[PDB]
Structure formats: structure tokens, C-alpha cells
Curated annotation (Swiss-Prot), chain A:
Function: Required for ribosomal protein bS1 (rpsA) to bind to the 30S subunit.
Protein name: Small ribosomal subunit protein uS2
Source domain of life: Bacteria
Organism of provenance: Escherichia coli (strain K12)
Subunit structure: Part of the 30S ribosomal subunit, contacts bS1. Some nascent polypeptide chains are able to cross-link to this protein in situ. In collided ribosomes contacts ribosome rescue factor SmrB.
The gene coding this protein: rpsB
Family membership noted in the UniProt record: Belongs to the universal ribosomal protein uS2 family.
From Swiss-Prot, chain B:
Gene Ontology process terms (BP): cytoplasmic translation; negative regulation of translation; ribosomal small subunit assembly; translation
Keyword terms of this UniProt record: Ribonucleoprotein, Ribosomal protein, RNA-binding, rRNA-binding, tRNA-binding
Record's miscellaneous remark: The strain K12 sequence is shown.
MF-aspect GO terms: mRNA binding; rRNA binding; structural constituent of ribosome; tRNA binding
UniProt effect for mutating K34 to A/E: Defective in ribosome assembly
Function: One of the primary rRNA binding proteins, it binds directly to 16S rRNA where it nucleates assembly of the head domain of the 30S subunit. Is located at the subunit interface close to the decoding center, where it has been shown to contact mRNA. Has been shown to contact tRNA in both the P and E sites; it probably blocks exit of the E site tRNA. Protein S7 is also a translational repressor protein; it regulates the expression of the str operon members to different degrees by binding to its mRNA.
Span covered, complete protein: 3 to 152 of 179
Protein name: Small ribosomal subunit protein uS7
UniProtKB/Swiss-Prot annotation, chain C:
Record family assignment: Belongs to the universal ribosomal protein uS9 family.
Superkingdom classification of source: Bacteria
Function: The C-terminal tail plays a role in the affinity of the 30S P site for different tRNAs. Mutations that decrease this affinity are suppressed in the 70S ribosome.
Protein name per Swiss-Prot or TrEMBL: Small ribosomal subunit protein uS9
Record text on subunit structure and interactions: Part of the 30S ribosomal subunit. Contacts 16S rRNA. Cross-links to the P site tRNA and weakly to the A site tRNA.
Membrane listed as a keyword: no
Family matches, as PROSITE patterns: RIBOSOMAL_S9
Gene behind this protein: rpsI
GO biological process, one term: cytoplasmic translation
One GO term describing the cellular component: cytoplasm
Gene3D superfamilies tied to this protein: 3.30.230.10
Gene Ontology molecular function: any one: tRNA binding
Keywords: Ribonucleoprotein, Ribosomal protein, RNA-binding, tRNA-binding
Curated annotation (Swiss-Prot), chain E:
Complexes and interactors: Part of the 30S ribosomal subunit. Forms a tight complex with proteins uS10 and uS14. With proteins uS4 and uS5 encircles the mRNA as it enters the ribosome, which may play a role in mRNA helicase processivity. Some nascent polypeptide chains are able to cross-link to this protein in situ. In collided ribosomes contacts ribosome rescue factor SmrB.
Domain KH type-2 intervals: 38-106
Short name of any one Pfam family annotated for the protein: Ribosomal_S3_C
InterPro entries the record matches: KH_dom, KH_dom-like_a/b, KH_dom_type_2, KH_sf_prok-type, Ribosomal_S3_C_sf, Ribosomal_uS3_bac-typ, Ribosomal_uS3_C, Ribosomal_uS3_CS
Organism classification: Bacteria, Pseudomonadati, Pseudomonadota, Gammaproteobacteria, Enterobacterales
GO function terms (MF aspect): mRNA binding; rRNA binding; structural constituent of ribosome
Protein name (Swiss-Prot/TrEMBL): Small ribosomal subunit protein uS3
Organism: Escherichia coli (strain K12)
Gene behind the chain: rpsC
Keywords: Ribonucleoprotein, Ribosomal protein, RNA-binding, rRNA-binding
Role description: Binds the lower part of the 30S subunit head. Binds mRNA in the 70S ribosome, positioning it for translation.
RNA sequence: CGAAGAACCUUACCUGGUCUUGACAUCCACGGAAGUUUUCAGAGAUGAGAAUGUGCCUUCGGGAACCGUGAGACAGGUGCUGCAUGGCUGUCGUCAGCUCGUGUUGUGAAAUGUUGGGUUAAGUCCCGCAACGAGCGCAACCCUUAUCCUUUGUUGCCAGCGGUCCGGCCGGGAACUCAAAGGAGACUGCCAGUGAUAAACUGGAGGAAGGUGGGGAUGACGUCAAGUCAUCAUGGCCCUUACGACCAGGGCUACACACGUGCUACAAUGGCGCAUACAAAGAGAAGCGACCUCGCGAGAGCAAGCGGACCUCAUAAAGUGCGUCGUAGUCCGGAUUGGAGUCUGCAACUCGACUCCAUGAAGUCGGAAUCGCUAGUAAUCGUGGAUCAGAAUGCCACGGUG
RNA sequence: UUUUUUUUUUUUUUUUUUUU
């Protein structure tokens, strides 16, 4: 946020440029996490592996777009639908991005 | 052992600018003391030319042809016993290894002086008569032959 | 007008001064031949100045503080190099290419404990 | 050539010292030396103050230990008296024995 | 498997001296015989409240003894007749006078020493010291520090029984030469033999 | 031999110049083999236990004579500590 | 071996003389000036006599500096166990360490980051992976270089002149070594080729090193249940008529056998004789000591000097130039034994250490097979140091013809 | 999936008490 990160020898600052690398791509929508999340939205139940188990452990609601390969018993809302690429999750995400802001009232 | 550093560079002889005449003496030294060993090798090359009255240092080659080998035998037990296979020596090696058999023939040779133990065995070596040439021809009788057993 | 150097090699301790014309080599009050009279290296001190036609152009004066003749042959190399190094900047490429700039500094990562060779780390083709 | 061997625990405290002797003494005669060193002992020093027998706490300090040479051509009192009137500097030593 | 001092190795780095004096080439030997003698009288006169730091300075070989004790009022006594004794007995051995300077041990809870002078009191009752030991540690850390480790060795049971006990109320990075850590020890007895206690107090990160 | 003999060095250690090393400065110079006088020496060798030089010495910081290093001034066991307060200035990491 | 001095010797042990607060050292009690000097005994510890001596305050109180005799408390030693433990040093390891503060698939001894695609000589480094990161090993400071920049000039030091009675002698100025304090600079830095315009490998511009530049150096957990159990610092346990402490003697070394470390001595790539050219590592007031006097010389003696470029030890060996054998059991072999000498000492002789002559045991190139030694590294060419009243052939460290 | 560069090298006694 200011200039103070360009401290010490130049290879000290760069050794954190390359932390920021390894972390904001994995982590850039969660930067605070000062309380525990209340709900989840998921698009795979294979490739996303651990998240569904952590959620069902602790008792979280899970919103899940699912195909002929799925396990529907592990969720709170199935939306049966084509598994992957942009056209599928486009057709659902309008109305998600709506309800989570006009629903604040 | 991954890096190219594997041989000494040395400088040329004080007269004819040749690392040939320089590696000769630097093989012959066996006890150290260089510069008087280099003047006594310079005395070998004059006792040489007493035979012929010209640049017999050109005939240095016409002896060294017979002392240079193509092959050497090193540690190769590969095949469950001694399986040699010498392999040839790379071009740079042909005449240094010839200096090795000129100096072992000179050590007990018997000639009056050490200038003459070297200048006589070079004379013989051009005659193929030599004891430095006999050692090489032994290896040719040995491992260049054993080409046919490899 | 004049140009100069000093050396440290096996084990001496020598200086050298370049001077105007007449082309000679004077060690304190005597000639080169009197000081290396048999000493087979002797040419190597006059060799790089005979390129640049010294005979009417330079003059070379020397003095020595622990002789050391077998090692002096390079203390003088380095020294006479520092002198020409302000005579003419052009020849730094000639002095390097001919080895005449080099000075003793290196051991080839040698023994400390037992092993012969001692910088290079464990090497494999995939361990 | 009377060698006054000037010596301080620190570079700090002999610099403060010597620069007055090469001024004060020189005013009318003898070309007075003062910066020229002796083998200055920049060593590593270790004392055991460890509150029990355990690993280390032998705090390695460095030192300066720095000596110089004040040199005068002759015992010319109308130039040299001034350094001998400098007896009040009880925090530097000089060893004049020659 | 090690005991590794944080202090001592670091005299000028947050962790200040037990003592410091300048005695010269042929005037050390008596100064050193006096540095145990002056500390033996004081640390038995001050026992009633301990001494976190028993500080021997000697400004002109005359001894500026600075005693950080948790009750200075009891060594000022009924107002300064003990001070008089306190400035004479340590000066009687040293042949020179003694600049007695007092202080408080500002909160024994957070201290560089006085936690081991809780514990080693607890043994003068001879009954279940285990009720109070790890509680004393707890109490101390409730007003200050961020981790502590404790080791106690000795005859602490009955008849023939001799063991060593080790506890950890918070994390301790054992040596970090930048940090506000301390090591200390103290001693106690129980009529069968020794009871020797040790601490490592990681109070802060710098 | 722990403490042993100290008393009998002490009893004559200060007067060797009075048993010989000034007593000598006229009578004993004619008694040399450089100067020849042969009847004179045979009366000055009588002092036996206090004939200079002879000295049992005193190891002091050590209480008993486990040698004496006459270059450093301490017992053949003490050395370790010099490296730990200033007494041997040359004792770094050994050259071996 | 530990002993870097097993014939006063830091005493093992063979002997005798003696003791068991001994030799050292306190807390009260009653008292005293401390010592210089010589005679005779005794192996030493210890025994019997003779002279000369009498301090500083000073309430003449109390005593000091400093010696007694009576008490009652009362003194000691490598004796080893690693295993109560904590320093210390190793050979591994210059592996880039293992595990945890959490979580949890393994109940738990399974590492759980090693998976599954690739890559680099490289746990290199691109991802992928249910994995974080805590941080004490990390990024590195460290010393010596070496090359310079200034300030500089030293017993140093002499660049260019100033006088030479030919000695840097003393005038005379600051090139630069020397000395060195503070320090300071080389990076893929741009060029040829390489391949993935990655990777890093060669040659080079540019250098005093190059891809840790080298030579010192720090040697983390883990170190073999390896030591320092003979100063450790100290828990558990030690002998006490005793493992405690005073004293002069003696003999350790034999020899038939080894067996090797460590030596050399077998003649010319050698030496032998006179003559010629160049360095230094280091040491020094329980010192080191020249010239100069005495010389067959070890060894006597005078005496300038020197505290760290001043005094002295080395005038390193080869090497060069002219002479000299003829391949010769010898001219060399010092194994050694005729006689001849001294520096030390109570003391070395059946115990040396070394000096002058006279010598002359093996001598002649011996195989079987313990590992010396890869680069500035064993041949090769030499010097010091302390233990200590002091002779290691040990080792220990840097130099160089090579 | 051909896997003989010799076959053999005595016993012990290592183990820092215990309930969690």
C-alpha cells in the first residue's frame, strides 16, 4: 500500500514479491478471514476434494451444480446440470450475484 | 569431477620455441633442480650433431616416430577378469609418452655421461635399435595385437 | 617522461623504471646478462618491449631487495606491465592475450582434511 | 630521532592526542611525525561470565589497541617544551625510553 | 539434551551485567576474591525478599553495590541502621568504602529471577509442593511474559527417591539473541538432599 | 612433595648475593681457571643447600608443583583458562 | 606411553628413616621483638655447641611486622562410573537437518511434505499435492590476502640532484616498495558459440582471482551408548593404620626374539677440491649476545649492544667456473673402538650428551606384498619452538629448485 | 525367466528404580 516494502538488500523485497505470487492467486478473495464462513457454493465434487468434507464436518450449507457422476446425498441444494466450462455456470451466476446484494435489505 | 581442468600448460624451450624440447627435459628431471638439467639437455643436442654436422634437431622427429605409440593399457577388469581393450592415446599424448620411455632407458643406460645416455639412445631410436623403441614395440606386440581379442 | 612498477613472486621484491631513449636494461650498476648469466628465463623481460621498437624510444632501469631469480622473472612481469599500463592504454589487449598481465592468486580448490579436491558438492544423474 | 611511542586502547583517543603534538611541538624546529603506525592489535577477546556451566556465554568482543610514533630531530626545548607540559593527559601513554 | 544460555553471550543487547569493574594488571586478584564475599553477605542479608540483581560496580574500586530486592523497606529497616551495617561489612573485606544503592524488584510476576524464588520457598513446608508449583508459574505468567519452561531435579519424594520433572506453560525459542528471553536457576532442600530448579522465560520476540 | 620444601627455599632464597653473588667480587676472580690461584676455591663451595643458582620454585595459583611453565608463569594443567580471561594473547584455534 | 627428561628430578616402586591433624590452614589461652653469622655431627629429615642482634605506632593501654608452647573443634587423594548431568573435542556433514505450536487420513511403532507430470550435475525449480509455517541450523557477518585510494611517513628510505674521504656515508625530495590505519573494488560486466532467447558451459573483452576466486574459519539437532572419568564443573558412591605427607639413596634401559615405526649406507641424474650468484619462516632480559682477544677445536673470555625492519644465529641446498679420480670395497660407509678432550652436576658409571686424531661392521641394487602421494601434493632443499636447573630421531607450521 | 569372486570369525556382559 506504500513504498516501505522496497527495504533492505533488493533480493529481500523480491523474496516476498514471490510469496505474494504463490499466495494471491490461491487466496486473493479471502485476504482477512477474521471470522468463520456461514455457507458454501461449489462447482466440482472431485477436483475440489477436501472442501465438501470440511463443510459436512462442521455443518455448512452447500449449493452444488451436479452431473450423472455426482453424489447428491452430500449437499443441501443440488442443481442437476452440465459439470464444466463457461456457458453452464454463466446461466446460474446472474441470479446468484443478484440475491447476495439486493437481498441485504 | 564435472569441470574441464585436467592438464598442465607449460612454456616453450629457450632456443627453438618448442614445447617438444621442453617436455623432454621436464620428463628427465626426476629430482627437481631444472635450469642445469635444461643446459645438459642443450648439451645432448650438440653431442647429437657431432655425428652429422647439421640440424640433427630435425632428425629428433626421425627418432621420435619410432618411440611414439598409438595405445596404452589401464584398469579394465569389466568382463569378470582382465579384459583389455587398451583404447588409443588422444593426439596430444603420442610424444609425451615417448619421452617417458626415453627417460626410463637413460636411467641405468651405461654411457660415459648423462648428455650421452640421452643423445645415443635418440641415435638408436632413429635406428629402431633403441631401448625406448623396444618398450613401445612391446606394447604393440601386446595391446595393439589384443585388438583381435576385445 | 617516466613510468613505473613493483612486484611480489617466489620470493622477491623488485622495482622497475621506464626512461627516455637508448634502449638498455640496467640493474643497479650492471647488465641483464651479469644477473641471469645462465638462468634460462632471461628473454621474457625484454620480449614485450622489443615489439614497440624500444631501441631509440624507451630505456629500462631496475633495482632489487631480495634477489630471488626463478621467481623475479614474474615479479618484473607484473611491474614492467604497470609501467607500460600508462605509456599506452592500447596494449592492455596485447599484455592479456600474451599472459603478461597475469599474477599468482589461485589454488584449484585443494585439500583441507584429507580429500585432494574440496569445493565441488555430491553429483549424480538422478540419485 | 627520539621515538615517543604514543599508545591508546582506541583509535578515538590517540587521534584526539597526536594531532596536538604534531602541531604544538613543531612550531619553531624539528619536523614532528605523529600518524605512523605500529602492529595494531584488532583482536578477539573472550571472558567466561556464564551464570552456570552450560554452552557458551563467552561474549566475544573486538578491540582496537593502536600505537603510533612521535619523532623529533633534536632536544630543542624552545620547540619541544609544549609536549612535556602536556603531562595532564593522564588517559594516554607515551614510552619515551631510548 | 542441551541447557543453552540465552543471556551472558549478549552483555550489551537488552540483557545487562551481573557485575562490571576495571581492575588493572596487578590489581584484579583481590577484587575477584571480594566479588564472592560481598555477594555472600548481601544475598544472606537480603534473603528475606530475595535479590533479582546483585549488581557489583566499583566506580573507583570502592564498591557501588546496587541491590534490586523485592522489599527495600526491610533493608532500610526502621530507617537506616541496617544501611550502615550493609555499607561496612562489604567494605571490611575490600579495604575500601561501599556506595550502597537500593531498588525495588518491580513486579516479581514478570521478573528475570523471582519466579524461581516462589518455587524454592514452597519446600520449607515439606508437604505436597505439587499443589503450588505449577500454580506459581501460572500466577506469574498472568501479569506478564508469553512462554516459559521449567526443569526441577532432586530428592523430592521419600526414603531413596531421586528424579527430574519438566513443564511448559507456553512456547520457548531456546536461544534467539534478539529477544527479551531470560535463563535463571535457584536452590532448595528437604532434609534428604538437594532440590535444584531451572527456568527459560520467553517474555518477548525483540 | 605437595607443599614439602617451601620453608627451606624461603630460609635462604633472599641472600645468595651474601652466600656468593657479591661475596665473590674480589677473592673469587683470582680463583678462576682464567687467573690461576688454586688454593682459594675449596673454601667457598661449603654453602651447599644455598649455592646459587638452585630454586625449588612456587606454582602459587596451583597449590602443588604439577610443573611450572617458565615462559607463562603457571602449572602444566592450568592452561585452558588463559584463552578465557586474557593471559596468553597468542592462543587462538590451534594450528593443528 | 600419560613421562615434552621412570640415575636430586611432579616417585610409580626397591629400601630405610619417620608421622599418623601431619605438610599447609583457623577459633582462645598464656607468651614473645624479627633475624644475621659460624663451628661440629648426620645419608636426608634432623642432632650438639658459640658469637652478634632488638626495628613502627605507642593512651605504655592495644599490638603490629612476626616467632612460640597448651587446648577443643580439625586437615587429605586422577578412586573410577560416561549410565544425575552440563561444558568441552571428534568423523560424519558443508547433507542444506530433523520435527513440531496445530490439524488428522494411519489405533500406533508409517515421516504425513518422497505422492503425480516434467526438469537441472544439483530438495536445481515449473507445478501439482489435504498443508501449513514456527524459527533456534538459513540469506552471512568472520580473518588473511591481493589489487588499490587517501592520509602518510618510521630504525624505514632513496624516484630526481647534492657532495663523495666510495660507507644511503648525510645533504635532499616525495615515484613506489616497505609499514598500515581507515578501508575500498568484479558484475554474466558485453562479446563468440551453445539450448527451451530456459538451463548454465567453454573461449574471451576487461583482470589481482573468476563462476565457494583462493588460503584461514564457524562444525547447529543428529555425532559411537566414541570420549576429556590424568586440572573437567559436579549429583550418586570411594581409603582412612589408610588411595593421607615428609626425605638421602637405587634400578628401570638387559638378551637368543622380533616387527614395525623412525633412520640411513650400496659412487658419476654422483661427489671430492678451491673459487663464485640470490631468501627467510621464527625466538629473546630465569634473555639473546657481535666485533675482538685464545684456538686441533667442542670450549674458554672481553665487550659494542637490542626490545621488537637497529643487536646476533643462515655465509638455505642445489646451481656456476676451473681443477681432480677412472667404475675403484674407496677417496665416500661413523656400524663402531684405539687412545685424546670438556659444558653441566651430590649427581651420567656398569647411564649419557658431544669435541680431536687413529679407525673400518654390513658393504654391490635383495622378493614375498603395509599403504606413502593427484598439484602446487609424498621424492627433492633446508630452519625454529617450548616441556625444563635439560639430549626426543617425535611432531607441529609455512616456504621453494621441483 | 543363467545366476557358486573362498567358507568359516566362542560365550557373556551392554541396557541410568516406579505408580501415571
Amino acid at each position: 500500500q506504500d513504498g516501505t516494502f522496497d527495504k533492505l538488500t533488493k533480493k529481500e523485497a523480491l523474496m516476498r514479491t514471490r510469496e505474494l505470487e504463490k499466495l494471491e492467486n490461491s487466496l486473493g478473495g479471502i485476504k482477512d478471514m477474521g471470522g468463520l464462513p456461514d455457507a458454501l457454493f461449489v462447482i466440482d465434487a472431485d477436483h475440489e476434494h477436501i472442501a465438501i468434507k470440511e463443510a459436512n464436518n462442521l455443518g455448512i450449507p452447500v449449493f452444488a451444480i451436479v452431473d450423472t457422476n455426482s453424489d447428491p446425498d452430500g449437499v443441501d441444494f443440488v442443481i442437476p446440470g452440465n459439470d464444466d466450462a463457461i456457458r453452464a455456470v454463466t446461466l446460474y451466476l446472474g441470479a446468484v450475484a443478484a440475491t447476495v446484494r439486493e437481498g441485504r435489505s | 569431477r564435472r569441470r574441464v581442468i585436467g592438464q598442465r600448460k607449460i612454456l616453450p624451450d629457450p632456443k627453438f620455441g618448442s614445447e617438444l624440447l621442453a617436455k623432454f627435459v621436464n620428463i628427465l628431471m626426476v629430482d627437481g633442480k631444472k635450469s642445469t638439467a635444461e643446459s645438459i639437455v642443450y648439451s645432448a643436442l650438440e653431442t647429437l650433431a657431432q655425428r652429422s654436422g647439421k640440424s640433427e634437431l630435425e632428425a629428433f622427429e626421425v627418432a621420435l616416430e619410432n618411440v611414439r605409440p598409438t595405445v596404452e593399457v589401464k584398469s579394465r577388469r569389466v568382463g569378470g577378469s582382465t579384459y583389455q581393450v587398451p583404447v588409443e592415446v588422444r593426439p596430444v599424448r603420442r610424444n609425451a609418452l615417448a619421452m617417458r620411455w626415453i627417460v626410463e632407458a637413460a636411467r641405468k643406460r651405461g654411457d660415459k655421461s648423462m648428455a650421452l645416455r640421452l643423445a645415443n639412445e635418440l641415435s638408436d631410436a632413429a635406428e629402431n635399435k633403441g631401448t625406448a623403441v623396444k618398450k613401445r614395440e612391446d606394447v604393440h606386440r601386446m595391446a595393439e595385437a589384443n585388438k583381435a581379442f576385445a | 617522461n617516466q613510468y613505473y612498477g613493483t612486484g611480489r613472486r617466489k620470493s622477491s621484491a623488485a622495482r622497475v623504471f621506464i626512461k627516455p631513449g637508448n634502449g638498455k636494461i640496467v640493474i643497479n650498476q650492471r647488465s641483464l646478462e651479469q644477473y641471469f648469466g645462465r638462468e634460462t628465463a632471461r628473454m621474457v623481460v625484454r620480449q614485450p618491449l622489443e615489439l614497440v621498437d624500444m631501441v631509440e624510444k624507451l630505456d629500462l632501469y631496475i633495482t632489487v631487495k631480495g634477489g630471488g631469480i626463478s621467481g623475479q622473472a614474474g615479479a618484473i612481469r607484473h611491474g614492467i606491465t604497470r609501467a607500460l599500463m600508462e605509456y599506452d592504454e592500447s596494449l592492455r589487449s596485447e599484455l592479456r592475450k600474451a599472459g603478461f598481465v597475469t599474477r599468482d592468486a589461485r589454488q584449484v580448490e585443494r585439500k583441507k582434511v584429507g580429500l585432494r579436491k574440496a569445493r565441488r558438492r555430491p553429483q549424480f544423474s538422478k540419485r | 630521532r627520539i621515538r615517543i611511542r604514543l599508545k591508546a586502547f582506541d583509535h578515538r583517543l590517540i587521534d584526539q592526542a597526536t594531532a596536538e603534538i604534531v602541531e604544538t611541538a613543531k612550531r619553531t624546529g624539528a619536523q614532528v611525525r605523529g600518524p605512523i603506525p605500529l602492529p595494531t592489535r584488532k583482536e578477539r577477546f573472550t571472558v567466561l561470565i556464564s551464570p552456570h556451566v552450560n554452552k557458551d556465554a563467552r561474549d566475544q568482543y573486538e578491540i582496537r589497541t593502536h600505537l603510533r610514533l612521535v619523532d623529533i630531530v633534536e632536544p630543542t626545548e624552545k620547540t619541544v617544551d609544549a609536549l612535556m607540559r602536556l603531562d595532564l593527559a593522564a588517559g594516554v601513554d607515551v614510552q619515551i625510553s631510548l | 539434551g542441551q541447557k543453552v544460555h540465552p543471556n551472558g553471550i549478549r552483555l550489551g543487547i537488552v540483557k545487562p551485567w551481573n557485575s562490571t569493574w576495571f581492575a588493572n594488571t596487578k590489581e584484579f586478584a583481590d577484587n575477584l576474591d571480594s566479588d564472592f564475599k560481598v555477594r555472600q553477605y548481601l544475598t544472606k542479608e537480603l534473603a528475606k525478599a530475595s535479590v533479582s540483581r546483585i549488581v557489583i560496580e566499583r566506580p573507583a574500586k570502592s564498591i557501588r553495590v546496587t541491590i534490586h530486592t523485592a522489599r527495600p523497606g526491610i533493608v532500610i529497616g526502621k530507617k537506616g541502621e541496617d544501611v550502615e551495617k550493609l555499607r561496612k561489612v562489604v567494605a571490611d573485606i575490600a579495604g575500601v568504602p561501599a556506595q550502597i544503592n537500593i531498588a525495588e524488584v518491580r513486579k516479581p510476576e514478570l521478573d528475570a529471577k523471582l519466579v524461581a524464588d516462589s518455587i524454592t520457598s514452597q519446600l520449607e513446608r515439606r508437604v505436597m509442593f505439587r499443589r503450588a508449583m505449577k500454580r506459581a508459574v501460572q500466577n506469574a505468567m498472568r501479569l506478564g511474559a508469553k512462554g516459559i519452561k521449567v526443569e526441577v531435579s532432586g530428592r523430592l519424594g521419600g526414603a531413596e527417591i531421586a528424579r527430574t520433572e519438566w513443564y511448559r506453560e507456553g512456547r520457548v525459542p531456546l536461544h534467539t539473541l534478539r529477544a527479551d528471553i531470560d535463563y535463571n536457576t535457584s536452590e532448595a532442600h528437604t532434609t534428604y538432599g538437594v532440590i535444584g530448579v531451572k527456568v527459560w522465560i520467553f517474555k518477548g520476540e525483540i | 612433595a605437595k607443599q614439602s620444601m617451601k620453608a627451606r627455599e624461603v630460609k635462604r632464597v633472599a641472600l645468595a648475593d651474601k652466600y656468593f653473588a657479591k661475596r665473590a667480587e674480589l677473592k673469587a676472580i683470582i680463583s678462576d681457571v682464567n687467573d690461576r690461584w688454586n688454593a682459594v676455591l675449596k673454601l667457598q663451595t661449603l654453602p651447599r643447600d644455598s649455592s646459587p643458582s638452585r630454586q625449588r620454585n612456587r606454582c602459587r595459583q596451583t597449590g602443588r608443583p604439577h610443573g611450572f611453565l617458565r615462559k607463562f608463569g603457571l602449572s602444566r594443567i592450568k592452561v585452558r583458562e588463559a584463552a578465557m580471561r586474557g593471559e596468553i594473547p597468542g592462543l587462538k584455534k590451534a594450528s593443528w
